Amino acid sequence: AVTGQVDVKLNISTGCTVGGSQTEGNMNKFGTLNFGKTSGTWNNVLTAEVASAATGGNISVTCDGTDPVDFTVAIDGGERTDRTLKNTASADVVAYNVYRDAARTNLYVVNQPQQFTTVSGQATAVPIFGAIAPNTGTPKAQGDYKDTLLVTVNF
Amino acid sequence: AVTGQVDVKLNISTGCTVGGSQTEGNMNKFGTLNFGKTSGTWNNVLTAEVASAATGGNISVTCDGTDPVDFTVAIDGGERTDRTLKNTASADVVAYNVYRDAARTNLYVVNQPQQFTTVSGQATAVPIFGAIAPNTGTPKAQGDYKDTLLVTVNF
Amino acid sequence: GCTVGGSQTEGNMNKFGTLNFGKTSGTWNNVLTAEVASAATGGNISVTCDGTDPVDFTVAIDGGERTDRTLKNTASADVVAYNVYRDAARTNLYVVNQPQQFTTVSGQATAVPIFGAIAPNTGTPKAQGDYKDTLLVTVNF
Amino acid sequence: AVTGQVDVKLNISTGCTVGGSQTEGNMNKFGTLNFGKTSGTWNNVLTAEVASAATGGNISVTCDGTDPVDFTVAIDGGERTDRTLKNTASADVVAYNVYRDAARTNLYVVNQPQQFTTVSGQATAVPIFGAIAPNTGTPKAQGDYKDTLLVTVNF
Amino acid sequence: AVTGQVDVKLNISTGCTVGGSQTEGNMNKFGTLNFGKTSGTWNNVLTAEVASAATGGNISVTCDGTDPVDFTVAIDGGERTDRTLKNTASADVVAYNVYRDAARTNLYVVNQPQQFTTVSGQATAVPIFGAIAPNTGTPKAQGDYKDTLLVTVNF
Amino acid sequence: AVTGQVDVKLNISTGCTVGGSQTEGNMNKFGTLNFGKTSGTWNNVLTAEVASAATGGNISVTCDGTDPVDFTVAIDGGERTDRTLKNTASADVVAYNVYRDAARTNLYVVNQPQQFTTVSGQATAVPIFGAIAPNTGTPKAQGDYKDTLLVTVNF
Amino acid sequence: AVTGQVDVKLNISTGCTVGGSQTEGNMNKFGTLNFGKTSGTWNNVLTAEVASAATGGNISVTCDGTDPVDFTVAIDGGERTDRTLKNTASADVVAYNVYRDAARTNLYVVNQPQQFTTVSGQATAVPIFGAIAPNTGTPKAQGDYKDTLLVTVNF
Amino acid sequence: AVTGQVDVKLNISTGCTVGGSQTEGNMNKFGTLNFGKTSGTWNNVLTAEVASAATGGNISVTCDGTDPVDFTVAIDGGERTDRTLKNTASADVVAYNVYRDAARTNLYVVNQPQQFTTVSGQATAVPIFGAIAPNTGTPKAQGDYKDTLLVTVNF
Amino acid sequence: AVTGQVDVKLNIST
């Protein structure tokens, strides 16, 4: 019998809120990274942007205050922690990655706070640009591949 | 004068130990559930994970032996027994809950042994995922809200 | 007078409960901690008073069989030092032979939290077996 | 701490692929819209066609299957979202537009899926015809003007 | 979803301009190759010169600078890519060709940069001499035959 | 890159044709204006008539129809645009002119449509009467002098 | 639009010249065939010789060189092509003919090169002997009858 | 190629006609100057008068009108232009002359208009009196000597 | 202008 304590805390004062999300039960549904349909072996880098579940556009984070707040954005490694989509039925995997800039260069490194700025009376967009490498080796099995990345807007 | 007996017992043989805790005086400090800063009325479900007081990551329970032991995890209802954080100065309360899975579905029911597995030469993590409902009604007073959940790793 | 609930009469001595720390290895790094379980119901000892005005009753726990709060192995002579506290944070200690004060109102039963706590033994591994002690809790007025 | 979910998806079954592109790092380089050299004030509409980065000719999109698939083509508004080329050093801008037909009539409207057809065993070309209005007012500063239009072949 | 990049460029420094054109909407109308009226079967080679839409004479290309610039001229294959005029109503076709010299010898080969010279303070003419072979076989249907050759003055 | 359009047209309905010509490659060879042999300094006006390349006589233009059509005849200024024959080897020039009537009065003015009539079931002749002024000044160098006048029968 | 070519030529080397002519504007006036005055009905063959416009005597053709050159002489059929003089006002005609020898035997056949010889340092005369048949039938109307024969000295 | 003009003229109004002639083909045969037979060396001047070919007498010129017209008579120098009769076979010549008066005094000078008068309703005779000098030197060869003098009645 | 011919003859023999 090892009984222990867990201090719970919350500082209600002046915070920042994330728009574009829908409450899926008790977990914020931020959006979808829909690469679309594809064949077994694709030569072109499959690339799609996150579509917020609430509006359809990009996640719009706004802060509540007058001075420009600096908030951070961190995305995790997905269900299996290595950014791989898994086929619903078979065990095939599809490696992918999420970048921050339009040219697929600034990668959202696993469990890292990619910095962001936000001014009063304005909503800043969180570009989560997906990208998949060209698979010109083995044709992955037919079906639907999925993953649930947890995006962590933290301060 | 009602004098009575209390039998004390301890079976020293082959037990299981919880890592990630720090001994706060004579009580094991397991960690912190830090939701962060927030405004009076938040529309998004505030959500944070427990951070072990010893390492900063998740509580890592390991057992001492060779066969996989099945240990249980039970969390209580907090200081007031209804999972509410209380403002340090005023009497305002903030209802919350702790879940076990990443999607806020498998709730750690009050005083219930949520089952867990553990194999030899490995440490299993105890995910205590916090979650707070969207308060879009009354703005709670400014300040710091706290609670001390007692996590009970028992066999 | 005032009466103590949650006890079972073991012969001619009131069995109040059990302080079960559970199973453990020779050397434990975490403070072993468990709460008293009343022998009658399984929960906490529920003391209720018989009357209309709120009575102030006291609770005193002794030092165990050997008077130094040590559990003894049933076979060998190894000992395991422990202590019983009153509050959930292991701070307010039930000092040996001391009347820790308590309140009780009419039409209500007050619980007597006897929170056990054992220090982290990271030195010598105590021998295998069962360690026991019989603390005598003294509800007096 | 606002943690949220982003569902990632990919339907590997029977897709369409775009030829004529080169993988620039992790972003598909489709081509170049080279208007050529020009003076400060040009009276003639400057006009050039996209040159695929892989072959030099037009982007050749082919689909993978037997039934004629209807795929769409969408081009965005450029780096600044208003189809303006910017001088590498100064802040001068050069407004332009991309059309689909040879007579500069069917405009690729910003973020719009201009429809397209494709049959089996054939590659369809994606004509991205550039066009710049006659500037007979102010002479833009000397140097190189650039823009990066993101072409979005989607299904 | 195959998203890709198209680099747009323009070098504003010292260019060459084409005179004799009129801006038809957003496409430069260079001129007309009017062979005139004819009967079903003509024995003489029908021959006419381009008439600039702006002045009525020959396209006058002038360069903007002091050193003699060498610019090129390229004409494409017409609407159907085989230099055939099509009847507005029926599907009859009339094969033709455009030459550069007055004796119908130096042909403007399809998609080829026929070289040209230009000196400062002077406008050079672009002779686009049309020529049609003698049709002494089948009488083409009555009506108007048309084609739109795209002339490409490039550097 | 200045890309432009050139509308090509042909009205196949009821036209007029020119006889007496031979197709030299893709250019209609109408005839020859042979002044003959001459000495360095000639006192008499050298004068000869055009000899059609097909028959040897005068160019016979006939129209295809029943109503009398009014067609025009235009002759240009020769290779150098000033009606001068050039010696094949040296740079000496011999000024000349082409008239329409037998008395060398009605001159075929440069780039001008000298009017003509034509009735059904008849061929009208196009008299191109050459004439050279008496050179009694400087003796032009020995050799052959040539020029290629482009006759333009247009409607 | 039937555009065609007319090759112009002149061989300046060693030619032959015709004397006795005057340049009437741009046409060589060779002479006059003056039959004189006559009545409505003449019984005698009216006969006169050509009188050169320059001297009054016979046309004197001389060649420029040392070897005897053989040059030809050709006379056409007059204004109406049937050797008829026309009254200036009325439509009456007077048929005539031009002979080469003094006895009216060797006729200058229409468009025919009647041969001639010429030696160095000498001028040969071109006898154009006119002759009119005796009209003893109908009296032609009063007035002046004219014609313009084109004499063609060619080599 | 020296092409030239010869104006032909005839004034049909009120003329004069010559009688006594016969049309030899297309040339008026006026008469014969028959000296008769003679020996190699004649001492007497051989003398004979012209005998008209039509009647046998003298040429009778009559004018057509009412006022007395003054017409002229001109005789040329014969075939060789020096008034010599030539033997048909050999090259011997016989010099002669034609006079106008009966006493061999008024000579018809070569190419000269010897004047004559003529009144209405009367025919005037043209005396062409021949005369040959006494040859008392060399005897000319046997045979027939001939000449054809062209008499020119002109106005 | 009425131009005409006059044949001239002489028979030198006896």
From TrEMBL, chain I:
Which lineage ranks, top first, belong to the organism behind this chain?
Bacteria, Pseudomonadati, Pseudomonadota, Gammaproteobacteria, Moraxellales
Question: Which residues of the complete protein appear here?
Answer: 24 to 37 of 178
Q: Kindly provide the name given to this protein in its UniProt entry.
A: Spore coat protein U/FanG domain-containing protein
Residue ranges annotated as transmembrane are none
